[PDB]
C-alpha cells in the first residue's frame, strides 16, 4: 500500500529527513505513519527498489517548486493594498471540538460560560484550553473562584475518557451562534481620526469632554492624536522652534529612531555645523534601546503639543 511505501521511504531517507517531512505532514498522517512504522519488521531489496522507483517517478512530475503560500500571499497583499487590507484578507481566508471551539472565542464570554459549572470542570476545561486563553479567562473570575481553580489545577490527576467525551458533548450543546464572532471595525483610533477632522472649536469642546470623562483614555487619545512620524508634514519654522525647545541628545536619539526623511528634514532645519555635529555623534555612538528612543520621542511630542497650544506651532 501507499502507506507502507511511504513508511519504507521514511525509514530509508534517514531520521533527519523523515523528521523534516513530518514537519510538513498533518497530525493524522504522522500518527498513521508512526503506527505503521512501529509494526515494520522486514523490507526486502525488491520492495526497497520498487519504493525508490515509484518515489522518483512521482517526484519527476513534481518537482513542483514548492512556495511558502502563506508568506508569499501576505507579502503580495501587503505590497498591493497596504497592511490593513492585507491583514483583513488574510483573516477572511483563515476563517471542531467543543474545547477547541472555546479557544476560538472571546475571553469574557467563555469565562461566564464556564463560570456556571463545577470548579473541577472549570479547571479541567482551562487545562484543556490554550494557556493564553485560560489566563485571560482566569483574570476575569472572582478571587474565590480563581483561587479554587488554581488549587484544583495544582492537584489535577487526569480525567476518564467517558467523562471527557460527555464534557465535550455538553460544551458543544451549550454553543451558540458563534460564527463570525466579534469584528474589527474601529474605535479610539477612529475616534481620534474623526476628532482630527472636526473644527478647532470642535476639538476644544473635545478636549473639554474627554478630560471630563474617565481621564485615562483621554490621555491615551492625547498621545494617539498626532504622532512623531507626522512631524515631516509640519512647516519648517515649527521644526526650528522644536529644535530650539528640544535638548540635543533627545533630538539625536529621536532622529536615530525615526526615518531618514524626517532625520534629513530636521538636519535641514538645523544649522550646518550643528547638523554635522549631530551626524558625527550619531555615527560615533552605538545602538539605543527602543524604550529610550520612544521616551525621548514622547518628550519631544509633549514639547510639540506645548508649542502648538501656545500658537507657536501649527499642526
Amino acid at each position: 500500500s501507499g502507506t507502507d511505501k511511504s513508511v519504507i521511504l521514511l525509514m530509508t531517507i534517514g531520521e533527519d529527513r523523515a523528521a523534516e517531512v513530518f514537519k510538513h505532514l498533518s497530525t493524522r498522517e504522522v500518527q498513521a505513519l508512526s503506527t505503521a512504522m512501529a509494526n515494520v519488521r522486514q523490507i526486502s531489496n525488491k520492495q526497497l527498489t520498487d519504493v525508490l522507483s515509484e518515489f522518483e517517478q512521482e517526484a519527476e512530475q513534481f518537482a513542483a517548486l514548492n512556495i511558502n503560500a502563506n508568506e508569499y500571499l501576505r507579502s503580495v497583499l501587503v505590497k498591493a493594498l497596504g497592511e490593513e487590507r492585507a491583514s483583513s484578507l488574510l483573516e477572511d481566508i483563515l476563517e471542531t471540538s467543543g474545547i477547541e471551539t472555546l479557544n476560538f472565542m472571546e475571553p469574557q464570554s467563555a469565562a461566564d460560560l464556564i463560570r456556571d459549572e463545577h470548579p473541577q470542570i472549570i479547571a479541567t476545561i482551562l487545562v484543556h484550553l490554550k494557556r493564553s486563553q485560560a489566563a485571560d479567562i482566569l483574570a476575569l473570575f472572582d478571587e474565590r473562584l480563581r483561587h479554587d481553580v488554581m488549587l484544583r489545577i495544582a492537584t489535577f490527576g487526569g480525567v476518564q475518557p467517558a467523562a471527557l467525551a460527555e464534557l465535550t458533548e455538553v460544551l458543544n450543546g451549550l454553543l451558540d451562534g458563534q460564527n463570525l464572532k466579534r469584528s474589527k471595525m474601529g474605535g479610539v483610533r477612529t475616534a481620534a481620526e474623526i476628532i482630527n477632522l472636526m473644527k478647532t472649536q470642535q476639538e476644544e469642546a473635545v478636549i473639554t469632554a474627554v478630560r471630563e470623562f474617565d481621564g485615562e483614555l483621554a490621555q491615551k487619545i492625547i498621545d494617539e492624536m498626532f504622532l512623531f512620524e507626522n512631524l515631516v508634514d509640519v512647516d519648517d519654522r515649527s521644526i526650528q522652534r522644536l529644535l530650539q525647545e528640544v535638548d540635543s541628545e533627545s533630538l539625536l536619539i529621536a532622529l536615530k529612531g525615526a526615518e531618514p526623511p524626517l532625520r534629513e528634514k530636521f538636519l535641514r532645519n538645523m544649522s550646518q555645523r550643528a547638523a554635522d555635529i549631530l551626524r558625527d555623534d550619531l555615527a560615533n555612538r552605538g545602538p539605543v534601546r527602543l524604550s529610550q528612543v520612544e521616551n525621548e520621542q514622547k518628550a519631544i511630542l509633549l514639547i510639540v503639543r506645548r508649542l502648538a497650544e501656545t500658537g507657536e506651532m501649527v499642526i
Binding site: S1, G2, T3, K5, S6, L9, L10, T12, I13, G14, R17, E20, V21, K23, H24, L25, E29, A32, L33, L52, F55, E56, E58, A59, F62, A63, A64, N66
Partner: peptide, 27 residues
C-alpha cells in the same frame, strides 16, 4: 543501492511530504 538513494535524500522535504500524502490518499 546506487546514487539514486543519495539523490532521493537530497530532495526537498515538502516534495517527499506531498508524495506521501498522495500515496496515502491513493490507499
Amino acid at each position: 543501492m546506487s546514487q539514486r538513494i543519495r539523490e532521493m535524500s537530497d530532495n526537498d522535504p515538502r516534495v517527499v511530504a506531498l508524495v506521501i500524502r498522495q500515496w496515502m490518499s491513493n490507499d
